[PDB]
A paper describes a structure:
A three-dimensional reconstruction of AFV1 not only reveals the gross morphology but also has allowed us to build a full atomic model for both the two MCP subunits and the DNA. Surprisingly, we find that the two capsid proteins form a pseudo-symmetric heterodimer that resembles in many ways the symmetric homodimer found in SIRV2, and that both interact with the DNA in an equivalent manner. Interestingly, the helical pitch in both SIRV2 and AFV1 is ~42–43 Å, but in SIRV2 there are 14.7 homodimers per turn, while in AFV1 there are only 9.3 heterodimers. In SIRV2 there are tight contacts across the helical turns, while in AFV1 such contacts are absent, allowing the virions to bend, extend, and compress. At the same time, due to looser protein packing, the AFV1 genome is not completely covered by the protein, while it is in SIRV2. Consequently, the lipid envelope provides a necessary protection to the AFV1 genome in the highly acidic environment of the natural habitat, rationalizing the presence of the envelope in lipothrixviruses. The outer diameter of the virion is ~185 Å, while the diameter of the nucleoprotein core alone (excluding the membrane) is ~135 Å. Surprisingly, the membrane is only ~20–25 Å thick, compared to ~40 Å found for archaeal tetraether monolayer membranes and the 40–60 Å found for other cellular membranes and the viral envelopes derived from them, but a crude calculation done by integrating the cryo-EM density (which corresponds to the Coulombic potential but will be roughly proportional to mass) suggests that ~40% of the total mass of the virion is due to the membrane. Lipids were modeled with a single phosphoinositol headgroup, as this is the smallest headgroup commonly found on GDGT lipids in the A. hospitalis host (the others are dihexose and sulfonated trihexose headgroups). These lipids frequently adopted a U-shaped or horseshoe conformation, and these horseshoe-rich envelopes with a mix of ‘inward-facing’ and ‘outward-facing’ lipids were the only ones that stably maintained the curvature and thickness observed in the radial density profile from cryo-EM.
Author numbering:
A (entry chain D), B (entry chain B), C (entry chain F), D (entry chain H), E (entry chain J), F (entry chain L), ...: 7 to 132
L (entry chain A), M (entry chain C), N (entry chain E): 6 to 136
Amino acid sequence: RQDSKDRYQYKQYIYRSIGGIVPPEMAETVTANQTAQWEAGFTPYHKLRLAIKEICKTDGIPNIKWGMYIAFGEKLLKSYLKMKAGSASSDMIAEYINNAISAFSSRTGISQETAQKIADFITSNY
Amino acid sequence: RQDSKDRYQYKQYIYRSIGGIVPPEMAETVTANQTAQWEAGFTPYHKLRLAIKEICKTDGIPNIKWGMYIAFGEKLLKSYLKMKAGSASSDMIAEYINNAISAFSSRTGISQETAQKIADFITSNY
Amino acid sequence: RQDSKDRYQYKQYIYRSIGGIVPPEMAETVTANQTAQWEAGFTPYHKLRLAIKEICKTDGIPNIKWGMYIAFGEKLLKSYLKMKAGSASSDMIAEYINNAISAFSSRTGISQETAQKIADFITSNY
Amino acid sequence: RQDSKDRYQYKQYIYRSIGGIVPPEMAETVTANQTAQWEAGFTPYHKLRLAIKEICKTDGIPNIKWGMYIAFGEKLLKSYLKMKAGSASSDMIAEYINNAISAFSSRTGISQETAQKIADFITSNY
Amino acid sequence: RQDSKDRYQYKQYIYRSIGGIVPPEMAETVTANQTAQWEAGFTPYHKLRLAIKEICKTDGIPNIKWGMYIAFGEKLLKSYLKMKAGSASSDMIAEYINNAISAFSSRTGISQETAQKIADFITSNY
Amino acid sequence: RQDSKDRYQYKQYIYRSIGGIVPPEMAETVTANQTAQWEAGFTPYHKLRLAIKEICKTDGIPNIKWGMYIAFGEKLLKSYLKMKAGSASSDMIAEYINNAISAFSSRTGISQETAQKIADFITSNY
Amino acid sequence: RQDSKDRYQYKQYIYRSIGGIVPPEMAETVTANQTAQWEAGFTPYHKLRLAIKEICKTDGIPNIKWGMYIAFGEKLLKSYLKMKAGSASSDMIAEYINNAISAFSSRTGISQETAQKIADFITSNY
Amino acid sequence: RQDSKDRYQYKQYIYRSIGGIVPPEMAETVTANQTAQWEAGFTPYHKLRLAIKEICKTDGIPNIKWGMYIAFGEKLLKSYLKMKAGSASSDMIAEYINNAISAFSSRTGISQETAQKIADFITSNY
Amino acid sequence: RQDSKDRYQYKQYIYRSIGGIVPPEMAETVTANQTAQWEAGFTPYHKLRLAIKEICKTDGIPNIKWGMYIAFGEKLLKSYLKMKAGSASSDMIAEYINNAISAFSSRTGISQETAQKIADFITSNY
Amino acid sequence: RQDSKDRYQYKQYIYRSIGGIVPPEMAETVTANQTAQWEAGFTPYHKLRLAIKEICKTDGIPNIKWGMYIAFGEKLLKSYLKMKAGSASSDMIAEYINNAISAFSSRTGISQETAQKIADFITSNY
Amino acid sequence: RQDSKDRYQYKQYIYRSIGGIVPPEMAETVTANQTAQWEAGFTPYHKLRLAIKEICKTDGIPNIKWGMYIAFGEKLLKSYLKMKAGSASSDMIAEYINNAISAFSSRTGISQETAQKIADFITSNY
Amino acid sequence: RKLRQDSTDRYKTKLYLWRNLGGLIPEDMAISVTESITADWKQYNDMMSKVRNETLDILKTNKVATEDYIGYIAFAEELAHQVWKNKNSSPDPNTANEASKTDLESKYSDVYGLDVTVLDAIYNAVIPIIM
Amino acid sequence: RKLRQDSTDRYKTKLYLWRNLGGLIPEDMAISVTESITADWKQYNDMMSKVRNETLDILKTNKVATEDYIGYIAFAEELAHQVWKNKNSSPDPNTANEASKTDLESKYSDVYGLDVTVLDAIYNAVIPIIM
Amino acid sequence: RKLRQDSTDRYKTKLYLWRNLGGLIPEDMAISVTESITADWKQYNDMMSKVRNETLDILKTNKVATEDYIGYIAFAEELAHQVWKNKNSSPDPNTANEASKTDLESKYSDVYGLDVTVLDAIYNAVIPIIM
DNA sequence: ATATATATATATATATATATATATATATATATATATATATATATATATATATATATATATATATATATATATATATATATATAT
DNA sequence: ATATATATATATATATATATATATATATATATATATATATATATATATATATATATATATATATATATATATATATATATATAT
């Protein structure tokens, strides 16, 4: 399903948002462009989520906790993207991890050991 | 009938759902894609149902009970697909079977012996 | 996103402003023209902002201060464009910098050293 | 902006003035014609204004005074167009300049030397 | 302006006079026809006026007096058109000129010499 | 003007007389038909009037008297049309002429010689 | 005029009689039908009247008497139509003629010889 | 006239009876339906009346007596329609004829021989 | 009748209650809403009544007693709805039944055996 | 019922209060606005009452006492809203509870243990 | 409530004051205008009152004293508006504060320290 | 309110548009949609809210983290549905048995624990589940 | 006023038009939009204003330049949301811990300093944050 | 009057039409426009008139030619805005400094002279500039 | 009657992404409208002074024509209503 | 099978009005266009120079909604397909 249905329908979504009042040379052309951005923008996080799934199976750890392994990973990737503006990533990374890990009950909910592993896997995504 | 009529009309269905307001470069292209997913997604369960039919004839057991041999099989396949996330399938399998079999009056309605045979046939589907 | 979404939607904006009462030979043709002006008009400042981002990373200085590095840079570019009317740019440049730098708390908020660097980078934009 | 936005929107203006009650074979056709006259009619004065801008930079004289260098130039061009009816332009020219220059505080506000230069540049426009 | 704006808008005028209650097969078709008559009917006098302008420049005589050179010329052309009914144009011409010239203060206001020249130029228009 | 403006506006007249309450399939269709009758019905008299104009120029006789040359001609044509019912046109013709000519002060007002010429020209119209 | 104006306006008449309260699917459709009946119903008498006109010219007899040649003819045609119910037309014909002719001062007013000719011409109309 | 005017106006009648307060989806739809019933209901008697007309011409008998040939025929047809409820038509027929004929002065007024012929012609209408 | 007439007219009722002074955006919108509540609110009891009808036929018991089988059932359903507030339904149920059954002459009037059956059928309605 | 009937009729109420003398652009617009405030203003207390209902069922305590569980809860919420002005909510809360609980016979009528639970549930509403 | 109910009803008030004798083109148009003035005129004081509420919470001071914090603030704002006529606001401000503070028992009733803070907050409102 | 109530109109929005784009009759659509939005909203929220509410309150009481509720809620409904299934199709002994055997089944997921066993007991005793 | 209040109508404008261009029913749209503009305006301004107002006043008190507020405001809300997250999902000790650990986290940005620590303490003690 | 007052209706005219051509609701538009024309007219004329009036009177007093006012007015507002900017964002010493440093900056234009320095001193002391 | 699957919408719990709108803080840009100060240009309307032209209406004098209504004299026809 | 009205059309034959068109000959208004020459407004565009709003896009940084897509996990409807 996620192999193709996304771009096909996502384009349909935008067409609807653009409205039937907008000539097709704009309606479709804008749609296609915005979709391409969705595909490119979405993928990086999608890759993380898929990787996380495999990590948990590898570790032999709970499926429910994916809600947080994912949240944790996704939050950090946003942070890693921001680091391309902040610079000094070494310090930014440590700081994001510091709370992402330490605030166990709200930022992890998952073993700090596995949370860090995710932090490391996410780091590798640049 | 089921040899071809499904993909032919299923595509027609989606076209209708998409709506006459959507340009054909989207209406048909989306339709065809979604249908392909139907074909691929559907088949695994279809194969089980067809296999089940033959098993009952082989065993020499009631046709009416197909409602449950099918329900039982289909439920388990969903479970087997989930096992690709859960891991430790050996234990998940046992647990699904434990209740699928034990709750005779609501999960089987069929001899536990034949229910297990189906559980085994379904297992082979990965 | 900013690689293409701007021209695509900006055109849509104008179409809306023009109104549904205006024939398409005017609605779209005007839209496309005005957009082209947006692209050309916008770019010069966009380039500065992007350059500024890199300068701060290079210097190893605060991200928050971009609000002013940008404001400072953008203000000066407007001034540099005006210099093409004023002439004697050598003096106009000095005067713009004089206050842009001196009024620290309201025109810079950033080290005068880095503010000047931006003034120099902006100058190179002609 | 002034390279194209004028004809594009000016046409839109007229369309609005013509009114939605007028059939498109008249609304657009009249619009396009009137616009063409705008372009041709406007240009001569536009050229003067652009030339004046360069003259002041060349001379190294005040930008504010463009309000008058322009007013002065534009007034004279109107006069030069009238000379194509009046004839004896040699005398008409002198007379227009006589007051245009002499009434310093209201017709020039600019050095008579530079005002005359503009009078000469405008003269060359026929 | 007078090169095209006349027929374009004049048509618009009539459309308005015809009224929004009249079907377009009549509104526009009548408009276009009446306009064509305007163009043809108008031109003969327009030609005179343009010719008169040049005559005064040629002679080196006052612009203000165009009010009368024009009035004089236009009146006579009306007379020349009437001569196509009256016949004996030689006598009608003389009579129109007799008063058109003699009543200096109200029919000419212009030198009789130049008034006659106009009478001659108008005569050539048949 | 009389070359086309008549049929164009005359149709407009009828449309108005028919009224805005009458559906266009009747309003315009009736209008067009009635107009065609106007054109055909009108022409015969129009031709006479135009011919009369030329006759007076040919003869070298007064323009004012056209009021009667026309009245005389038009009256007789009506009579000639009636002769297509009366028969014995030779006698009807003579009788119409007898008074049309004899009652000089009220039926002619024009030389009997020229009145007869018109009677002859009209006769040729059948 | 009578070549087309009748059906065009007669339809308009009925439309008015039907009333503005009646939907157009009835107003026009009824109108058109009733008109067609007018055309067909009217024609037979119209033909007689036209024929009568020619007969009088042929005979060389008075125009005024058309009031009666027509009345006589029209009355008889009504009678001939009635004969298609009465039968024995030979006798009905004679009887209608007997008084139509004999009551000279009120049924003819025209020579019995010409009245009979009309009776014969009308007879031929069946 | 009777070839079409009936259904056209009869519909108009009902529309009036229905009233202007009733929505057109009911006013016209009911009208059209009721009219169709008029056409079908009316025709059977219309056919008789037309047939009767021809019978009298065939027989060579009085037109005035149509008032009774018609009344007689129409009365009997009503009776024949009733026979489709009564059965034993052979006896009902005889009885209707018995008085329809015997009461000469009020049920016939026409020769019993011709009255019977009509009774026979009507019988054939079922 | 009860298949649709209820919602159709019930809406009409409310419209009347709302009053002709209330704008239609309120009159109809409120009406439709309140009706929907009628449909939903009514149905639960309607279902019971219909079920009761069938129970009596099944049992082979008196029709007249429906007045009480219905009253009994309806009363209990009200009680069952109240139990969703009271909790401890097991005890509330017993208590409602205790008197609903015991007070034979006023709460049942029907065999306690059949009254209990209804109590059981009603219980199943939650 | 309470799912929609409130806003529908409440609007009707206001319309009545506004009066039939007030133009609809005010009558309805004011009504709709005031209703929206009712919905928003009402809800907070409605939520408490619904929550209280569930608490009593959960606890297994008397329905009659809802009169006080509700009164108690509603009073406290009013107090909690006031605390947004008073500040130092910790102390205000304690004081409201002090009497709300202590004056058993008039402020609770319910076990202090359950009254406090309500005080705690209400507190969570901010 | 105060987010919208004010303008909605305030308009209603004026409508009532204007009277039912005044045509709606005046009644509503005047109402709407006067209301707009209410909104604009009211807001400045409303802002102060809201600010004061927050100041007292911030300071941790008595709610009852709002009667005076408000009175004090509102009085001063009136004074600040008057200063736009008086000029020399520095002195007017001091004088208003001098008594507004000094007459503790009647102009403040609140700590002079907090009264001054309000005087300062109000001052910032211009 | 809005997060459970407004769903009526949002669901309505599509159901109408789905049909509207088919060129169908405005009136028939409005009717079909009305019935659809009613069935959807009513059936969903009635069954779901009862389970979800009990589920949310119990899990919160038991110190369940917000990221944990999904497991217990996904089970809450699945289990609650099986409870109806049995109340409808099976003997009381099988309803009781199945409830216990399903709690065991749920062990396939890391989620399963005391929380589940508590929740199901509540559903069986308390909630008239739609299915 | 206008800069926080008029947003209701501007937001309304689009939400209606978005749907209007879909050929949807005027009434359903007006209803769906009404609910949307309410949820938007209400939820946004309530949560945002409380934080933004405290944030603006504190930062101004502490001599923060107008170009600096962005950092502290962007944090103000982010932090304020995390405060709710914890009040909702975590034990009180974790709410306190997270607040302090987040203040540390915020060091990733040049913005972080005393101003942040002051602001968060206020949010925790004062504002009923929506999330 | 007309040259400052009628702008309300002319601005209104477009703002309505801009939206009207989008197929938007007449009522919502009338409301959105009303707020727009108010904000426009009010904010513009209040700030602008105070500066422009003082600017016009001072420049006229100082024998400034009508063609000269543009420079001083364009500066008048620009400067007046910077005055607010500082009153809002900077320490009083910086407001004073900036005013003087800006007067210097203004030298980039041939316009700058005593007239400017006089005008800015007035704006700082007199006008509650909107920005 | 029970259970899948593909899509479409809404929910439950948390978190992304693409776009759409509004905000918070400051500053650009493209267009749209209004202003400030002076001056053009294209069109739209009105004026000032005189004179045309195209159409639209009315008149002065006489006479047609096409239609619309009424009359004068007799007689039809189509429909509409009432009578015998 | 025939008539009396009224409204429409027609025939023979003519007229009085009213509205439209035309001929000869001319004018008074009103609306449109033009010539010579200039201006006051209003709406559009532009030049020099700057700003207040509103709508769109963007930068830094973050959020609240709404609509779409996705991940983990499950469900209620509706529309399509499938198995018995």
